[PDB]
Design a protein around this nucleic acid. Structure first.
Ligand SMILES: [Mg+2]
Ligand SMILES: [Mg+2]
Ligand SMILES: [Mg+2]
Ligand SMILES: [Mg+2]
Ligand SMILES: [Mg+2]
Ligand SMILES: [Mg+2]
Length: 185
RNA sequence: GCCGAUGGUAGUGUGGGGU
RNA sequence: CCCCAUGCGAGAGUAGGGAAC
C-alpha cells in the first residue's frame, strides 16, 4: 500500500504562522538531502492515519518532482493531540531501517494447555531496500508451549528483509496461568 | 548503553505591541 | 503571559557517523 501527499518547500515563513494557516511544518532528508517543507495538516492527518510509519508516502513537490518517503517522526505539540512538526525520510537506493507490523497467527499449544500468550512486540525493526518493503511479517505461535519464547531469530523473514534488532529479542512467549502478570482481584 | 546534525520545540537576550 | 520583529537555542528523538555484518 502506498500513499500520496502534496508537499511544498519553505524558507523564511515562520512555523507558528504556517500552523496558524492550517499547514504543518516539517522537513525531509536522507544521506543526500535535507530541505524544510510543509504540508496541509488535514491532508497529512488523513494520509498518516493509513500509512503511519509503515507505508511509503509519495511527496508531490512544487518542482513537479516526486519523492518516495517514510514518516520518521511526528512531534506532537505537548498538552494536546496534534502534529506540530513532521520528518520525512526520503527513500533512496540504499536499504533502510524501519518498523514492520507483526501479524501473529495460530493458537499456542501452551494456550490449549491453559497457558497465557503474551505478544511482547507489535512491530519489529528490520533493514530493507525500499523496493522490498513488506506489508507485515506473519508470526505463527501455534508452537509455543507454556514457558516458551519466540525470538527475533525465529521470525520467518521475507527475502531481502533482515533483523535490525538483536536475534535474542523476545517477540512472544506463553506463560502459565493462576496469575502470571498480576491478577485483578 | 559511543559520536551526532538539520528541522521543530522548551527556555532565553533586545525592541515593539496586546488580552 | 501572549503576539510580532530580530538574535541565540536545548533536553529527548531522527538522518548520518563509530562499531558490527
Ligand atoms: Mg531564565
Ligand atoms: Mg536546532
Ligand atoms: Mg540534542
Ligand atoms: Mg544509527
Ligand atoms: Mg559476514
Ligand atoms: Mg552498515
Amino acid at each position: 500500500m502506498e500513499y500520496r501527499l502534496k508537499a511544498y518547500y519553505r524558507e523564511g515563513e515562520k512555523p507558528s504562522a504556517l500552523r496558524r494557516a492550517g499547514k504543518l511544518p516539517g522537513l525531509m532528508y536522507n544521506r543526500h538531502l535535507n530541505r524544510k517543507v510543509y504540508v496541509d495538516l488535514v491532508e497529512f492527518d488523513k494520509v498518516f492515519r493509513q500509512a503511519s510509519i509503515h507505508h511509503v508516502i509519495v511527496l508531490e513537490l512544487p518542482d513537479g518532482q516526486s519523492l518516495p518517503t517514510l514518516v520518521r517522526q511526528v512531534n506532537l505539540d505537548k498538552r494536546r493531540r496534534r502534529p506540530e512538526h513532521v520528518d520525512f525520510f526520503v527513500l533512496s537506493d540504499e536499504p533502510v531501517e524501519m518498523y514492520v507490523p507483526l501479524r501473529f497467527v495460530g493458537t499456542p499449544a501452551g494456550v490449549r494447555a491453559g497457558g497465557v500468550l503474551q505478544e511482547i512486540h507489535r512491530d519489529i525493526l528490520v533493514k530493507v531496500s525500499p523496493r522490498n518493503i513488506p506489508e507485515f511479517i506473519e508470526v505463527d505461535v501455534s508452537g509455543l508451549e507454556i514457558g516458551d519464547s519466540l525470538h527475533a531469530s525465529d521470525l520467518k523473514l521475507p527475502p531481502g528483509v533482515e533483523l535490525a534488532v538483536s536475534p535474542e529479542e523476545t517477540i512472544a512467549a506463553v506463560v502459565p496461568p493462576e496469575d502470571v502478570e498480576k491478577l485483578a482481584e
